[PDB]
Every structure is written in C-alpha cells, then in structure tokens.
Amino acid sequence: NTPSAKKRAKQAEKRRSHNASLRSMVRTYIKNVVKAIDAKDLEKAQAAFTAAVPVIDRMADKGIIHKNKAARHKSRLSGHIKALS
Template sequence: MANTPQAKKRAKQAEKSRVRNAGQRSNLRTFIKKVLAAVRAGDKEQAQAAFKTAVPIIDSAVTKGLIHKNKAARSKSRLNARVKALVLGE
C-alpha cells in the first residue's frame, strides 16, 4: 500500500483513470463490433454508416491516449478493407 502522500494521490488518480479508460475502451470496441456485425450481415449501407461513425471514435481514442496511433491506423485500415470488399463484392 502507498505510504507517502504522493503515492496515495497517484494511487487514487490511477484508479480514476483506470475506470474512465475501461469505459472508453468498451465504447471503442462496441463501435468496431457494430461495423463487423454489419459486414457479416451483408448490409452494405449499414456497414458504411457504422464505419463512418467508428472512425472518429477510433481517432479520439488516440488523442486520449487509450490506444497507439499505429493501432488506430491498422484498425481503420482493416475495417475499411472489409467494408470495401463487401461493397465491391456485390
């Protein structure tokens, strides 16, 4: 357990950020899953709409320090490739 006042404060701050980050990470994953679900269902319009809403959320996760910018770029690229394959495939 933290002994110094600084360590006690950092422990409280770390717990606050852990809870906040967990919620934001869950939200991020939810929007990614919505895109993937629309692609699996074969719904082109819904997949494109879900992708358009997911991109800003992925970008905001980077600015908040939730994920690395390369992970965001990789996620957006993979989602876009699936959406495009769905649109071009039919």
C-alpha cells in the first residue's frame, strides 16, 4: 500500500516466474544423471553428467541455487559414476 511496495511485489513475481524456470531446468538435469545411475547405463550416465555439469554451474553463478549446492551434486553424482565399475 505504497507505490514502492507495489513495485517490489510486482517484480518479485517476475523473478519468481523467471527463477522457477532456471531451478526446474537444474532438477531435470540431475534426474537424467540419477535415472542413468539407477538403470545402470554407465554410457548414458556420462552422457547426462556431461550435459548436467555445465547447467548446474551456469545456474549456480547467477544465484539460482547456491555454489555449495552445486558442488554437492557434482561431487555426489560423480561419486556414483565411479561406483559404476
């Protein structure tokens, strides 16, 4: 109920809509690595993990997820791919 707070609520929805896209695109890149670790496809595990690591990091730099959350996935997913041996 002031024009400055009407502007912040209006532009936090624009950032909620935008950032929901870029978080959603990170979960699916980690699904495809996890589904290829579950279904024992080692040759498609690195096909998705080499797709996912550039997307985990590119989003963690614009602050959509945290850079310790990003390192946590890449450390855990590439710890399961060495476990597929």
